[PDB]
């Protein structure tokens, strides 16, 4: 695990790294958020920003020093601060940014700055390739509402890795979330859709926990299931 | 205002009618649901099905008898029974059907049959015209999650009418109704988006009330304001 400033990096495969940023906040402590960095031939692809523009810049600085390839594009997984808080740093660096159209639509409402481009999805959940030009091994899937209405998901082709973002909870989590933009009705089915979209992923990377097995997916849907009846 | 089988039709403008149908529920008597019929030159456009296939067939029969123009297409406003229950009646009649891609994605989970085509929306909420061919005066807008994640909205060009579907409740409603699929965080902003998208609409048609003034929007948005709670 390479430390770089306030960011931590963990190689998950040749060509794939997890980036982790921390939001240092009173009462709680540091809240971790994870994203991905993927080397695809002669360029780098990033999934998710860090919490802040300055932390995101540090990712880019780490990429420069450790990998020394240019960053072609970033995909951002939904319109929350842990995923899109550093969009300005990506834009300032001349990186082409992508998000779900709905994520761009909601961005202003949240405190976020919108990605430059909007991804669109088929009825099957799969991204319309015309809207995701040159994503290389990044396979982008919209599993349905869950953690959020806009949440998207990313598989990394030629690896066992799939990224659930904040949709999939840890195999030992007890809660699905605190905020009313989680879709309690559909969550379980969204969790499962994700699993069905990347049936070969054995390593399941997520926003707030160390990578886990496919048990995270099962656990997350099960939770979602039991809760559906208890929400006031 | 006219009765035809177990449906009710109400002319709202030259060229525009409200269709009403009823589903007996155990919770209480007949529950009404409203949709639209629009004459555009030499063809008819339909917004929303009735609750059932049979009831939707009667809408077609009424169109035949009262307007006697062919039905070019139907747009459906979200994946719930009152809006999409009659999809099979539309497809058996050879009518081209459209829904939010998300509505089509969610359909199976919801007991619904998917539309034949998927609508896609820009970051600003307006429908991508390439996905909505020949919609004539139908101006389709996705205001953001509210009643449902997938709820869409329709303005009728050259009229004062805007259709909020189940997003908007009338200005005298005691509640926002069923919140099971609702996005409590974004609802108020989605309500307002709708209003901002059709700033000239003075007649606001909705799924479960008689047409109302713009006060319905304000009232809806304000009820929804009371749903956002800060969570520690
Ligand atoms: Zn989030
Ligand atoms: Zn998160
Ligand atoms: Zn509904
Ligand atoms: Zn309804």
Curated annotation (Swiss-Prot), chains A, B:
Give the cofactor binding note: Binds 2 Zn(2+) ions per subunit.
Where along this sequence does the record place binding of Zn(2+) 2? 82, 166, 208
Q: Which cysteines are joined by disulfide bonds?
A: none
Q: Which reaction does it catalyse?
A: a beta-lactam + H2O = a substituted beta-amino acid
How does this protein assemble?
Monomer.
Q: This protein is called what? A: Metallo-beta-lactamase type 2
The UniProt record gives the binding positions of Zn(2+) 1 as 78, 80, 147
What species was this sequence derived from? Klebsiella pneumoniae
Additional remarks? Enterobacteriaceae carrying this gene (identified by PCR) have been isolated in Sweden, India, Pakistan, Bangladesh, England, Scotland, Northern Ireland, Australia and the USA. The organisms they were identified in were K.pneumoniae, Enterobacter cloacae, E.coli, Proteus spp, Citrobacter freundii, Morganella morganii, Providencia spp and Klebsille oxytoca. In India most isolates were from community-acquired infections rather than hospital-acquired infections, indicating the gene is widespread in the environment.
Give the location in the cell: Periplasm
Q: What does this protein do?
A: Confers resistance to the different beta-lactams antibiotics (penicillin, cephalosporin and carbapenem) via the hydrolysis of the beta-lactam ring. Does not confer resistance to the polymixin colistin or the fluoroquinolone ciprofloxacin.
Main localization is: periplasm
Q: Which UniProt keywords apply?
A: Antibiotic resistance, Hydrolase, Metal-binding, Periplasm, Plasmid, Signal, Zinc
Cofactor entry: Zn(2+)
Give the EC number(s) listed in the UniProt record.
3.5.2.6
Main enzyme class: hydrolase
The Gene Ontology biological process annotation of the record reads: antibiotic catabolic process; response to antibiotic
Give the similarity note: Belongs to the metallo-beta-lactamase superfamily. Class-B beta-lactamase family.
GO MF assignments: beta-lactamase activity; zinc ion binding
Q: Where, by residue number, does substrate bind?
A: 169, 178
Q: Which GO terms describe its cellular component?
A: periplasmic space
Give details on activation and inhibition: Inhibits by captopril, thiorphan, dimercaprol and tiopronin. This enzyme is not susceptible to inactivation by the beta-lactamase-blocking agents clavulanic acid.
- Source taxonomy: Bacteria, Pseudomonadati, Pseudomonadota, Gammaproteobacteria, Enterobacterales
